[PDB]
Write a protein that binds this DNA or RNA. Structure first.
Lengths: 236, 40, 273, 256, 236, 40, 236, 40
RNA sequence: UGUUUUUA
């Protein structure tokens, strides 16, 4: 018989090792494969899909209103919303991007941020979406915000703006978990001109906010999420 | 080298390099080009 | 592979940044569309986000206490914990459940790892060299009724014998009746007013019965068995909204009454950072 | 070369739908509905393909969108069980397979504000409000053309109706992973979603199992102009396509 | 010596693994092979053989009468027999098909159901054999039964009808153990016209019922049967 | 690769793909065709 | 299964064995490599770099003065400095050469010893650097020193002399740890003529001493240094 | 022969035979030859 | 040509 020497770490159970094993059902034929639509090979496919951000993260309970960014008429040089860009935390935590991101430790690449206007067709508004790279505070005024990466958004026939947050980092990868060194910066929106509503219309109109990954997006080092928990093993 | 008769005995397949996010991102009947008016 | 292309100033009637999300389409807008970009490369394959990697590592799915003790004067060996039965499900430990429930249909070959660890909480002179039998009981096969019943014979049933402290490791092919398992089933067994919703045998992996084949010693030794499941050759369909609220039951989408808000309320207004 | 992508016509059988403010139709998972091929077939019985007698637009009884409407949910093929010849075939056959062209309609003025999320959820397994292991009863999951109004009260053995949690314990904002379209009143008055047959089996019982679920959910609430009726009708029109039935048999009796 | 690492599941005894092993009788010559008729390679060969169904499953003890389906003369529009099609249960449990089926967890494919008439040659009868696919109850009348898969059987020179139960299922495989979701449906027989007996003949005539598998039949996931049991290991 | 001298040491043979149910199903002297009168 | 026999030393953990092992992060992509200057492949690269010797090893505390070899004006036939050539000990212990050398048990090859004069430009001096091979004592006078390997150094425009200590050994390798048998010998410096200082300048001028390895230098048999110690495991 | 999918699983690379001490020993702009006056 | 790449 072949002389062998067993290395240390023999008889260890490692939850990550992909080894062959004996089948407990030999010569068993598994059910044939049929065509099912919506086959997912990679998470990086589905993370490229826009999902609503609960940006109006200001409610006592979870509400539909939490997804609605309020716009107010006849407001000049004023803030619409503001958020940090810890995508594994805050407003982003509950989004598909955030949820998938939290299954991983490191992230890189560009984020895709969308705003959709839901006000009357006979209304008009210009907004400025501003991304503030890290190292500077969240902008406290518009003049400060516009110094960074920004898109001036004219609201018209096209209801949606798509502002890409360009990958602005020294280190090649950022932490998904809120970390100071790997802070992504800040995102803000301001009134460029104002919201003008047509006659016979009152009150607040709303933006819908979306977040998606750009195809240059990266995730690595899988981890357990903190988005789900249990004390007791479940029963049927 | 596989040490077993069964396909279930084999190791994982690694990676499907074939992605197509379009089926989720752009499941539209008419083609929409980036830059072109979404509706006309 | 190019990550970012070189792109300079744009003065164009093509506005890649303007779209209509009303279409339900996510336009593949790049940084090159919003800013001036430099050429960068990916240096990245996306190997770790493949479903085989995402869904294809071992996870605890079941934990059970069984006791090797004298069976004299015991009427039910299942309920005295001389043996325990587990209806195989991946929906009992929530961390793995959420991962699987990112999808509607999953087809995978399984790889089970069973780890038995002993403890003698009361006076014991030695650590017994117990052998656990893990017996796969598919639906229809006689479920064991006694710890040394004729069932354990396993003339046709798959069975594993392994020492406590050590482990077992066996592959199981995709055993589903359908072309894929249902993580979700919006239906019933039949058209009946009181029949079970969601719960269906489409996901009946089978059952696993655990006994210690050893006869008794004078001391009671408690063996906690931990079943680990690793999915292999994973195929997944129909991505879903991630689970937000905690679970209450296996195979049900039920969530608790008076559950807490999961959207993380801000400190300050919508303007705060 | 001029024309429009907002002006659309869908003709199925003897039925024709027109729209002049359409957003680009969604084809769920970029897959058009098709008849089951012989390589995926299990059942040996030759399938009845009922053609234009069932493959036609059935308009569902209109809903009223108010400022306080939470939303509506329909189950397919359940919603069409009382619709002409499709419903009959559904009950006379053991097995059924069908794709759908869903067409949701909500028109308003250029003064109106509001946004509907029209989303198709495969295997929309509802959650019970009673928690624990309580089951949702057959009658509540199979409402028919009435559908489920999420603004309504809970019922014993009924589903949970908090639209925020998608009736299933997932968040509303993430439904966009499912094939969806918005009716943004400023942009759009009609959503269209072509659904293929989605199941783990090639053909299935149409009575006991609902393959897909149509949800119409107000995201941005209805804001009507001053002095207007604080209501808009929402009309759902569904057409089966590539419909197959197998195992003809005595008519099935279902609860209620 | 070759460095090795022992995987977890080392030293396990798995009753299904087909490994090489040392022979305890080296250089032993086993007896030569001779030709024996009736070689069985596969169970799917023998399961295609017709065996009698104890359809008259109505007796206090097991009887030959249990295999005899009674026919009565001058009965119009009336039921002959009825059974569900759980082939691993009921009338089918004790048949060769049922016995082999119970050694497996999943079954698929078409069943072959035969009736053989044993009445006088100068007798006449027309029967309708009806298969009711699942989702509908067992037919309570003939008009209900004939809506499903049925064979109208004219009894004459050919004594036997062979009605194939076509594989009518959504899911590709059914459970052998009685399960509601994977119910196969119902089988019934009715008087199409009636049984007419010749003069000088009285009382009941009988059908023999047979069940066999069609060559498209499938079985998988072996299991222990519940058709045999023991409390004590046997002695000679 | 077999690690032993003995044939008994080898693993199972897998499957005999050669079926013939005829020897059990149709053990008749004269040939009977499906469709033809069984007796004439 | 393949018959094996486990050799003795199976299940041993040897801190030196370079074996394959299962990765705990499968399919993980490590951060891309970028160009960083100053890549070190081998210690023998960096050990060839001159580092200052604390030759003036005569202070109560570690001082900059310890690196300064004092020269005194108008001294004839007198010693400047003296040291043994245990490079893993004494004045050499703290140098880069000494530090790297102490990570190894054996050393061979030639040392490169440099002196840099830091006195006024209008000053003049001739020094004799003398290497005394082992077997003879450290030279007590110049006449004794000059009998060995020596460089007479004229101090001028070129500030630095580079005296190579040639590998003078019978045994091919010497011990880094002070050992009598593998003694490398002695190094000394003497006034060849004298230090002459210009008018209006007083007191001591200084030499800087450097030690480096020649490219024929060898080190082997890695070992733990005694240049660092701890009683308690550290915390953050 | 590597028994694993991962590069991290492999053994050490042995030796980089490519040395260049010049980058540390002679990091000078102008070339300095042994024997030539260091400064002129 | 208010043109975008690639190579010396």
């Amino acid at each position: 018989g072949l002389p062998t020497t067993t290395l240390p770490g023999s008889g260890q159970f490692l939850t990550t090792d992909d080894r062959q094993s004996p089948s407990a059902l030999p010569n068993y034929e598994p059910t044939p494969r049929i065509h099912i639509p919506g086959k997912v090979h990679n998470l990086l496919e589905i993370i490229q899909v826009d999902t609503l951000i609960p940006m109006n993260n200001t409610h006592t309970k979870d509400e539909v209103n939490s997804y609605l960014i309020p716009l107010n008429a006849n407001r000049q040089n004023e803030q619409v919303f503001g958020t940090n860009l810890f995508i594994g935390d805050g407003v982003f935590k509950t989004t598909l991007l955030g949820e998938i991101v939290q299954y991983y430790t490191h992230w890189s690449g560009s984020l895709r941020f969308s705003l959709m206007y839901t006000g009357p067709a006979l209304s008009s508004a210009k907004l400025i979406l501003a991304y503030t790279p890290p190292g500077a505070r969240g902008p406290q005024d518009r003049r400060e915000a516009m110094l960074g990466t920004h898109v001036v958004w004219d609201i018209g026939l096209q209801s949606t703006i798509v502002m890409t947050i360009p990958w602005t980092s020294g280190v090649q990868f950022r932490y998904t978990d809120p970390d100071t060194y790997t802070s992504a910066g800040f995102l803000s929106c301001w009134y460029q001109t104002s919201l003008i509503l047509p006659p016979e219309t009152t009150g607040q109109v709303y933006l819908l906010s979306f977040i998606s990954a750009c195809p240059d997006f990266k995730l690595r080092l899988m981890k357990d999420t903190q988005t789900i928990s249990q004390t007791v093993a479940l029963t049927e | 080298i596989n040490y077993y008769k069964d396909a279930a005995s084999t190791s994982s397949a690694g990676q499907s390099l074939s992605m197509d996010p379009s089926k989720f991102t752009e499941p539209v009947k008419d083609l929409m080009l980036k830059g072109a008016p979404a509706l006309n | 592979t190019v990550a970012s292309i070189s792109s300079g100033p744009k003065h164009t009637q093509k506005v890649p940044i303007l779209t209509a999300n009303e279409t339900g389409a996510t336009m593949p807008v790049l940084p090159s569309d919003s800013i001036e970009t430099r050429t960068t490369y990916m240096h990245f394959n996306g190997s770790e986000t493949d479903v085989e990697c995402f869904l294809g590592r071992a996870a605890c799915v079941h934990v059970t206490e069984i006791q090797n003790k004298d069976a004299t004067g015991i009427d039910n060996h299942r309920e005295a914990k001389l043996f325990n039965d587990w209806k195989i499900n991946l929906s009992s430990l929530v961390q793995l459940r959420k991962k699987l429930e990112l999808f509607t249909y999953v087809r995978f070959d399984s790889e089970y790892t069973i780890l038995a660890t002993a403890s003698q909480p009361d006076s014991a002179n030695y650590s017994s060299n117990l052998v656990v039998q893990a017996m796969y009981v598919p639906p229809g096969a006689p479920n064991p009724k006694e710890w040394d019943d004729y069932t354990w014979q396993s003339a046709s049933n798959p069975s594993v014998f392994f020492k406590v402290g050590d482990t077992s490791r066996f592959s199981v092919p995709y055993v589903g009746l359908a072309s894929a398992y249902n993580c979700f089933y919006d239906g019933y067994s039949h058209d009946d007013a009181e029949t079970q919703y969601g719960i269906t045998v489409l996901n009946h992996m089978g059952s696993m019965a655990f006994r210690i084949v050893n006869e008794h010693d004078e001391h009671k030794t408690l063996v906690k068995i931990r079943v680990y499941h690793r999915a292999k050759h994973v195929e997944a369909w129909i991505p879903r909204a991630p689970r937000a609220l905690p679970y209450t039951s296996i195979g049900r989408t039920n969530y608790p009454k008076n559950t807490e808000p999961v959207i993380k309320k801000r400190k300050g207004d919508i303007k705060s950072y | 070369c001029g024309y429009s992508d907002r002006v659309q016509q869908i003709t199925l059988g003897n039925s024709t739908i027109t729209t002049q403010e359409a957003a680009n139709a969604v084809v769920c998972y970029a897959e058009w509905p098709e008849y089951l091929p012989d390589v995926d077939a299990s059942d040996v019985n030759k399938t009845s393909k009922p053609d234009t007698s069932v493959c036609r637009f059935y308009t569902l009884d209109s809903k009223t969108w108010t400022t306080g409407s939470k939303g509506w949910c329909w189950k397919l093929p359940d919603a069409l069980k009382d619709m002409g010849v499709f419903g009959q075939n559904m009950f006379f056959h053991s097995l059924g397979r069908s794709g759908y062209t869903v067409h949701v309609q909500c028109n308003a003025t250029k003064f109106h504000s509001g946004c509907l999320l029209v989303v198709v959820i495969p295997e929309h397994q509802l959650a019970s409000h009673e928690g624990g292991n309580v089951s949702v009863k057959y009658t509540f999951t199979h409402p028919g053309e009435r559908g489920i109004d999420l603004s309504s009260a809970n019922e014993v053995g009924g589903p949970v109706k908090d639209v925020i949690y998608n009736m299933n314990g997932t968040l509303l904002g993430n439904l966009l992973i499912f094939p969806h379209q918005f009716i943004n009143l400023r942009t759009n008055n009609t959503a269209t979603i072509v659904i293929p047959y989605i199941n783990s089996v090639p053909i299935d019982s149409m009575t006991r199992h609902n393959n897909v679920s149509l949800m119409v959910i107000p995201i941005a609430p209805l804001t009507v102009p001053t002095g207007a009726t604080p209501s808009l009708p929402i009309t759902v029109t569904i057409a089966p396509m590539c419909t197959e039935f197998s195992g003809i048999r005595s008519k099935s009796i279902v609860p209620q």
